[PDB]
Write a protein that binds this ligand. Structure first.
Ligand code: SF4
Ligand code: SF4
Ligand code: SF4
Ligand code: SF4
Ligand code: FES
Ligand SMILES: [Ca+2]
Lengths: 588, 146, 905
């Protein structure tokens, strides 16, 4: 049985446990290509099912994802409960190394679900986004307000009857929103943001945005301060919302790849990898080994690029300015190799459904050798010049620390979760793209996720990525760069240029689009900043019926108030520098 | 009708006796082939007759018999390529009874499959060059399938 | 019947084959040579499935699903590995000789062969030998020919010969050199040859008129519209790109015009793209012209009309029900006049009275094919209502269908049905002034003058029932042929009587009504069909109004000083000199029209009306069915200076500016409600389409496909800033991709057929309840009137025999499919198809006047002499002269008229 085959996962022990606890008629198991068991739960049993999953012997500890779905235009709903809308809950058991996707069906007029925030606190922002984009009410939510769109927005953009395209620009609305911006500083009400005790006559209120002079993006945080101590902080996000999921419903499976590039814009091919893997699951494509090695090498090069940017930006946030110049020189070496291979620097859009766009150019190994000889001396110099400086250690050590429980309850992934001591990397736990054929280590922390611990873990991850690149350079299969599947999009170019069957396939694939049979697919990867996942629903057409992107920066930004309360503002800047987020990843 | 070997000369000329031997009684007007006749050339001549006597109504006969003719011409000239005998075998499989509109194409593919079954060494002798369907296009690296 | 496909149980019709049953169930089986309208022949072998003997069978046998009945307890597998391999091999065999042509082939993106190549999953070529090639033929102005792309699926010859009855297409040659085309270069002679471009699954036959301004299907903007070129009401999908009407595709209507158009509807759209069209309101000051915007035109026209003493209106059967009603509201009902002549109006109201008071059911166009005897009286159906002639051809083949059904032959096995019914056919009796295109299948053709055709009809009615009035002076040979017709019609289980207003005689319509009444009185299931002239002739007849001659007398006596003329070239319905005099005398002439007509030089105001591509409205076909057409594109999107509004919008805004001095344009549903409130006989046009608030789960219906390209570059030469999307407050369609075009959407109006994996016209399969049936939620359009409980009385006014008169030439109409409909003559591609205007003479009359074939003769009509070259017509009886109606200078009102001083030039 291939790894992309449709499965019901009835042999998962959690299905038997749910059978024993709630009975056999309490839920409906759906066969998908997501790789996880998908269970349709009644709305009135959702909290009991969630608590039961949380109290298992090897429990489901993390709410990985929570979002909605407009099911009104879905023609192929065979074996599914009747639903105008639905809400899905992706939960991860680390100890079992397993997931489960709960789905609640909803009628068009009865669009309310009990809140999940008492079980998992990251459900706050997830349910705010579900209410914002789908209009689904969550009963019991502390502050159910719009998080992506402005508060005075009409409609819900991810509904199927909402038009995707930009409306006609009016300067009157711009001047009205400017007046809103200049009056908000005078008419601030600290109850509509979920805040309490709105002036003790000592709480000073500051704003950090909505413009930030940094590479992670521009965003606003409202700070409630007692002297220099943060007693409350609520973020304002959605300032970089690009409608990427709605655009996923508008582009074909092939033409959406450049949009996947710009989710986490320091990631590139790393961002492309989960999307093309999920589409290949929908298409039933098993890529050859050379494709796996090529995609792994590109992803590791972009991971080194992103980590160099993160370490240099953290050092600049501490107060040392020269390592960012040197790290950008190293980024230029990486960009030389990436430009040679893909023809682009930052958004290569080079991965394809079933492979990559072109073969590797002649002489790529010389550039890889030059980079692999250039990097380690520079990394050691960076450590000795900035990372071992006691001023940086005093700025970083002990600042915004959390343990394993706080990381699990907020959906924290990546270097923060591993800095809490939990050894969970996607490339080892749920291997993808031939990562099992590479010998590399996963660095973990001692149990405390500090700013310094996260930065040093990212340094060791950079060294491990250099090891993976060395193994990629020494071991390359001499095979195809595209799979021989009929749904490989586009087909190989020379056969397109001289064979009529291949020309026909290319013609229909680039114009109407490749036809993906109706299914649901899922793929999570270890991105540069945590776990990035694509959840794709095909209704049998040439475009996605639903593209859901889970990004780790959303979860880390939601974890910000739990870890920074009672600290200084300078500690908040250091924490923002040590998270490794970008606002495009947050808002999508 | 399917070719038969020297060992088949002892069975009676009846419908079921020839039919169980893998051939057809047909008109019962047998034709002998001596050792000086190349089987590839003979089956090429047979398939040229059958391909040019197609009525053109249905796709497998009309567009699959000329492909077999061209493969046999290449095999006779020593310009056969790997996969050609496999293509001939699949053509015999897919031009059988029921797949075509009438019985002309099953009768066409009976001698080809019988000669491949009994005289495969003459057909493999025609394969003398590697498979090449594409020319190199300057500036495009080919997808090197294994 | 119960079938089991891939382990799933299904209930199907046992009289269907497996391919049509499985395609009706939503399953995907590739196919080439089968068509729903043509039956099954089993040529291409693409539709192979694996049939098992029973449930406990594992070997199976490959069969053609199109040639296998969907009998009870059938067991088949589509996704069987051997069946999939064979279907891929069939695609591969078709691909061995196929040219490397998709970028430069007009079928790309709309190609059934491309779709089935992808559907079978065949994308790797291992064939390395040479590809056969073919020279192409010139097939005339409409169809381009490319035989390299042929897959020899025989669809073209089966449609053209067996279905459409054409004779100049065929299959030639042998084994892999089979060639589909004509015996030599020349124009395809069939009136229905244009359906080849959708019948052919490849790019062999392509729309040449589209090919001149080619664009791909995904780049088109479509709308569900009605063909304007005659009264049949065939549903069409006009598709546009860059502001110009690019193509007319057939839009499936299971009740009207299911898969097929005629060539006039398909290729006679080119008048929309004419550069001399009015784009904006123009007002003449002295000898100069000034261009106004819509507000200034409304204010000025309202002021001048308010100053006038009496405003009269002249509508048109071209224009929709809403626009004619808006004219009638602006000028008043008593001051409203129909734009057609007095005799034309009398024949039209008599046809309407027979249709909605004759007590005899009038069948839809699809229903015509089930009648087992046809009598056509006077109406040259092929040149005036061509799709009715196609349906009558199918009804004639009904006899072979009956004899095949007697021998337990399945209704889809078309070759066996044609073999059993060799040349036996249901009786067709056509009457005309000359030979018709239906004569090759007609049991009898009566070439006689229109009064003699009416006398034949009255004699048939009297021989069917003695209460009908008798005809005295019938020759014994004509009496014997009348007895043949009467014996054929009396023994028929379902006789059909077809007539129309094109014959130009009231007594022909009365004779048809008397035959229908006589057949009704004997308990037969008789149907009657009337053929009107133009797209909304029946709507103008239902609305009513005075004739054009009454409006001309009003403008000539001077008691009417302002005239509004809507969508009307007045020279078609009246003499040109009288019209020019009455319009030069009138101090105010306002013309609302979308074409540069001849009365726009004497027009004081000209309003740029929209054509059917740029307007919404309702038209009534000759069956009595109200059908809504929708706007295709916004004319102001590319050229913002274009002020081209709906005619009812213009006239409603004029009435509002006249009354309240304020400019309110309107909404379409308000005009619909106004029509159904003032006119109760047009109350059905409310239900023809849902209103503009109609939604499919909250979203509108899309006009363009999902992959519509170039949205940030198609106007970038004008300005790099993208304009706003056009807003459609009129209808439920949106001018964008942001809409719904799902085949399962609960609607009846479908702008275009597309499904994932089905990019060709075969996606109409997905848009149907069963393939070849109706649309899934019903065909659009509703009948305005039901069958009356009581019929009429017998018309006792039997006309006398035609006597020739010396110096008096009775004009016999000779209609043409290419040339007798005004807007289609305006299309530039119809000039190549335009026959040279020849005046038809009897050999005896031409010998008496001493003129041979090809000589120019001059005749005087309305005090004006015109010269036309002579063609000898044997069938035209003496005392008649044959003229081509509707041409340049020969109005259709001349049909049935006399002529004076025909002399050799
Ligand atoms: S198998 Fe028979 S029907 Fe088919 S093309 Fe050949 S001769 Fe004609
Ligand atoms: S007919 Fe179809 S497959 Fe052939 S060249 Fe044209 S688009 Fe391509
Ligand atoms: S010309 Fe077209 S319709 Fe005719 S046999 Fe060839 S592919 Fe079929
Ligand atoms: S029959 Fe009449 S309505 Fe139909 S396509 Fe022809 S011209 Fe148009
Ligand atoms: S569609 Fe059945 S053989 Fe052609
Ligand atoms: Ca409109």
């Amino acid at each position: 049985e291939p790894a992309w085959q449709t499965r019901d996962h009835l042999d998962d022990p959690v299905i038997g446990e749910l059978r024993n606890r709630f009975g056999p008629d309490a839920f409906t198991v759906q066969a998908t290509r997501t790789g996880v068991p998908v269970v349709w739960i009644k709305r009135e049993q959702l909290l009991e099912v969630g608590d039961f999953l949380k109290k298992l012997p090897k429990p489901y500890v993390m709410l990985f994802d929570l979002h909605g779905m407009d099911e009104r235009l879905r023609t192929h709903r065979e074996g599914l409960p009747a639903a105008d809308f639905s809400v899905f809950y992706h939960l991860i058991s680390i100890d079992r190394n397993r997931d489960i996707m709960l789905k609640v069906a909803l009628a068009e007029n009865d669009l309310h679900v009990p809140t999940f925030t008492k079980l998992f606190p990251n459900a706050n922002w997830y349910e705010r986004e579900t209410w914002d984009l789908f209009g689904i009410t969550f009963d019991g939510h502390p502050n159910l307000r719009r998080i992506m769109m402005p508060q005075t927005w009409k409609g819900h953009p991810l509904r199927k009857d909402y038009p995707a395209r930009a409306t006609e620009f009016s300067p009157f609305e711009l001047t009205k929103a400017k007046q809103d911006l200049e009056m908000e500083a005078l008419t601030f009400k600290p109850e509509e943001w979920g805040m309490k005790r709105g002036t003790n006559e000592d709480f000073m209120f500051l704003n950090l945005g909505p413009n930030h002079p940094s590479a992670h993006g521009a965003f606003r945080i409202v700070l409630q301060l007692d002297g220099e101590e943060i007693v409350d902080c609520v973020p304002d996000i959605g300032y970089h919302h690009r409608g990427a999921e709605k655009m996923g419903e508008r582009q074909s499976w092939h033409s959406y790849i450049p949009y996947t590039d710009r989710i986490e814009y320091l990631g590139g091919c790393v961002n492309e990898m989960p999307y093309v893997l999920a589409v290949e699951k929908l298409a039933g494509i098993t890529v050859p080994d050379r494709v796996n090695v090529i995609r792994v090498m590109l992803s590791e090069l972009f991971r080194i690029n992103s980590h160099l940017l993160y370490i240099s930006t953290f050092i600049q946030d501490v107060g040392a300015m020269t390592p960012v110049f040197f790290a950008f020189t190293d980024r230029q070496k990486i960009y030389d190799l990436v430009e040679a291979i893909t023809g682009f620097r930052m958004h290569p859009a080079w991965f394809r459904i079933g492979g990559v766009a072109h073969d590797l150019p002649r002489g790529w190994d010389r550039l890889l050798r030059e980079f692999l000889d250039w990097m380690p001396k520079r990394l050691a110099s960076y450590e000795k010049a900035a990372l071992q400086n006691t001023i940086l250690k005093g700025r970083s050590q002990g600042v915004a620390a959390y343990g394993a429980k706080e990381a699990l309850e907020w959906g924290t992934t990546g270097a923060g979760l591993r800095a809490t001591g939990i050894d969970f990397d996607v490339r080892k736990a749920r291997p993808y793209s031939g990562y099992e054929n590479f010998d590399f280590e996963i660095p973990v922390g001692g149990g405390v996720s500090d700013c310094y611990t996260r930065v040093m873990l990212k340094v060791e991850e950079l060294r491990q990525s250099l090891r993976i690149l060395e193994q990629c350079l020494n071991n390359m299969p001499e095979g195809p760069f595209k799979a021989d599947h009929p749904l490989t999009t586009p087909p190989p170019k020379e056969r397109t240029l001289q064979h009529i069957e291949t020309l026909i396939t290319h013609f229909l694939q680039v114009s109407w689009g490749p036809v993906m049979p109706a299914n649901e697919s899922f793929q999570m990867i270890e991105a540069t900043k945590g776990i990035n996942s694509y959840y794709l629903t095909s209704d049998g057409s040439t475009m996605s019926y639903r593209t859901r992107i889970r990004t780790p920066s959303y979860a880390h930004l939601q974890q910000i108030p739990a870890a920074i309360r009672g600290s200084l503002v300078s500690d908040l800047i250091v924490y923002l520098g040590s998270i490794d987020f970008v606002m495009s990843d947050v808002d999508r | 009708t399917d070719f038969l070997t020297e060992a088949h000369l002892d069975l009676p000329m009846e419908f079921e006796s020839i039919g169980k031997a893998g051939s057809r009684l047909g008109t019962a007007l047998a034709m002998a082939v001596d050792h000086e006749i190349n089987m590839v050339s003979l089956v090429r001549n047979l398939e040229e007759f059958f391909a040019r006597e197609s009525c053109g109504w249905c796709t497998p006969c009309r567009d699959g018999l000329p492909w077999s003719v061209k493969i046999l011409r290449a095999l006779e000239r020593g310009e056969g390529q790997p996969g050609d005998i496999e293509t001939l075998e699949q053509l015999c499989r897919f031009l059988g009874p029921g797949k075509t509109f009438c019985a002309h194409a099953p009768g066409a593919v009976e001698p080809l499959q019988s000669a491949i079954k009994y005289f495969r060494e003459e057909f493999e002798a025609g394969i003398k060059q590697p498979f090449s369907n594409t020319h190199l296009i300057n500036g495009i690296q080919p997808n090197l399938l294994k | 019947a119960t079938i089991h496909v891939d382990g799933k149980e299904y209930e199907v019709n046992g009289a269907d084959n497996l391919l049509e049953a499985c395609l009706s169930l939503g399953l995907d089986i590739p196919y080439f040579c089968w068509h729903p309208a043509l039956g099954s022949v089993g040529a291409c072998r693409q539709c192979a499935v694996k049939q098992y003997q029973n449930a406990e069978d594992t070997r199976g046998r490959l069969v053609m699903s199109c040639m296998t009945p969907a009998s009870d307890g059938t067991f088949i597998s589509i996704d069987d590995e051997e069946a999939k391999q064979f279907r891929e091999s069939v695609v591969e065999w078709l691909m061995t000789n196929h040219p490397h042509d998709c970028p430069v082939c007009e079928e790309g993106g709309n190609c059934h062969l491309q779709d089935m190549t992808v559907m079978t999953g065949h994308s790797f070529r291992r064939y390395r030998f040479t590809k056969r090639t073919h020279r192409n033929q010139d097939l005339g102005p409409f169809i381009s020919h490319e035989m390299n792309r042929c897959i020899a699926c025989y669809r073209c010859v089966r449609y053209y010969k067996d279905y459409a009855g054409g004779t100049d297409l065929g299959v030639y040659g042998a084994h892999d050199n089979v060639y589909f085309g004509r015996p030599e270069d020349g124009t395809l002679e069939s009136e229905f040859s244009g359906n080849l471009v959708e019948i052919c699954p490849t790019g062999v036959f392509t729309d040449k008129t589209h090919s001149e301004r080619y664009n791909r299907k995904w780049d088109m903007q479509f709308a569900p519209s009605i063909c304007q070129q005659c009264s049949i009401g065939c549903n069409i999908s006009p598709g546009e790109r860059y502001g110009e009407l690019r193509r007319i595709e057939n839009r499936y209507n299971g009740t009207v015009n299911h898969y097929f158009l005629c060539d006039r509807g398909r290729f006679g759209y080119g008048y929309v793209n004419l550069k001399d069209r009015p784009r904006q309101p123009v007002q003449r000051r002295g000898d100069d012209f000034i261009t106004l915007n819509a507000e200034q035109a409304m204010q000025g026209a309202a002021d001048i009309l308010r100053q006038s003493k009496k405003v009269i209106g002249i509508g048109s059967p071209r224009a929709s029900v809403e626009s004619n009603f808006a004219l009638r509201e602006l000028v008043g009902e008593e001051n409203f006049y129909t734009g057609i002549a007095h005799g034309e109006q009398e024949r039209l109201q008599l046809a309407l009275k027979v249709l909605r008071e004759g007590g005899i059911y009038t069948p839809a166009l699809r229903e015509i094919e089930s009648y087992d005897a046809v009598l056509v009286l006077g109406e040259d159906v092929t040149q005036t209502g061509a799709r009715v002639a196609l349906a009558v051809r199918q009804a004639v083949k009904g006899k072979a269908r009956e004899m095949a059904a007697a021998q337990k032959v399945a209704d889809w096995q078309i070759a066996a049905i044609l073999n059993i019914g060799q040349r036996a056919k249901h009786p067709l009796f056509v009457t005309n002034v000359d030979d018709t295109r239906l004569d090759d299948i007609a049991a009898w053709t009566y070439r006689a003058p229109v009064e003699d055709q009416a006398r034949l009809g009255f004699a048939i009615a009297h021989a069917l029932d003695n209460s009908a009035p008798a005809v005295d002076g019938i020759e014994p040979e004509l009496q014997s042929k009348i007895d043949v017709i009467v014996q054929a019609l009396a023994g028929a289980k379902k006789p059909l009587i077809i007539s129309g207003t094109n014959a130009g005689s009231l007594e022909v319509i009365q004779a048809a009504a008397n035959v229908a009444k006589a057949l009704k009185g004997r308990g037969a299931d008789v149907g009657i069909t009337m053929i009107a002239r133009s797209v909304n002739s029946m709507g103008l007849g239902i609305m009513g109004g005075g004739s054009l001659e009454e409006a001309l007398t009003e403008l000539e006596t001077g008691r009417a000083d302002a005239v509004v003329v809507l969508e009307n070239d007045l020279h078609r319905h009246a003499s040109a000199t009288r019209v020019n005099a009455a319009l030069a005398k009138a101090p105010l002439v306002m013309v609302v029209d979308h074409q540069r007509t001849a009365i726009m030089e004497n027009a004081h105001l000209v309003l740029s009306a929209a054509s059917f591509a740029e307007s919404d409205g309702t038209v009534i076909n000759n069956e009595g069915r109200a059908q809504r057409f929708f706007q295709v594109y916004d004319p102001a999107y590319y050229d913002s200076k274009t002020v081209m509004l709906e005619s009812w919008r213009w006239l409603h805004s004029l009435h509002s500016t006249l009354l309240s001095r304020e400019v309110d344009w309107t909404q379409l549903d308000h005009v619909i409600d106004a029509v159904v409130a003032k006119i109760p006989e047009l109350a059905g046009i409310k239900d023809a389409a849902p209103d503009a608030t109609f939604r499919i789960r909250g979203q509108k219906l899309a006009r363009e496909p999902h992959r519509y390209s170039g949205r940030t570059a198609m106007r970038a030469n004008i300005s790099v800033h993208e304009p706003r999307q056009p807003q459609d407050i009129d209808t439920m369609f949106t001018f964008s991709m942001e809409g719904n075009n799902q085949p399962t959407a609960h609607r009846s109006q479908v702008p275009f057929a597309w499904a994932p994996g089905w990019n060709s016209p075969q996606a109409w399969n997905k848009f149907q309840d069963e393939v070849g049936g109706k649309l899934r939620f019903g065909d659009p359009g509703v009948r305005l009137f039901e069958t009356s409980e009581n019929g009429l009385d017998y018309f006792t006014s039997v006309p006398a025999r035609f006597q020739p008169q010396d110096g008096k030439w009775r004009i016999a109409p000779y209609y043409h499919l290419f040339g007798s409909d005004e807007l289609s003559q305006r299309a530039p591609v119809f000039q190549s198809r335009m026959p040279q205007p020849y005046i038809k003479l009897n050999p005896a009359d031409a010998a008496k006047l001493g003129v041979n074939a090809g000589t120019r003769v001059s005749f005087s009509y309305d005090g004006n002499t015109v010269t036309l070259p002579v063609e000898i017509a044997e069938g035209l009886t003496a005392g008649q002269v044959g003229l081509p109606m509707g041409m340049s200078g020969i109005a259709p009102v001349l049909a049935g008229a006399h002529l004076e001083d025909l002399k050799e030039a």
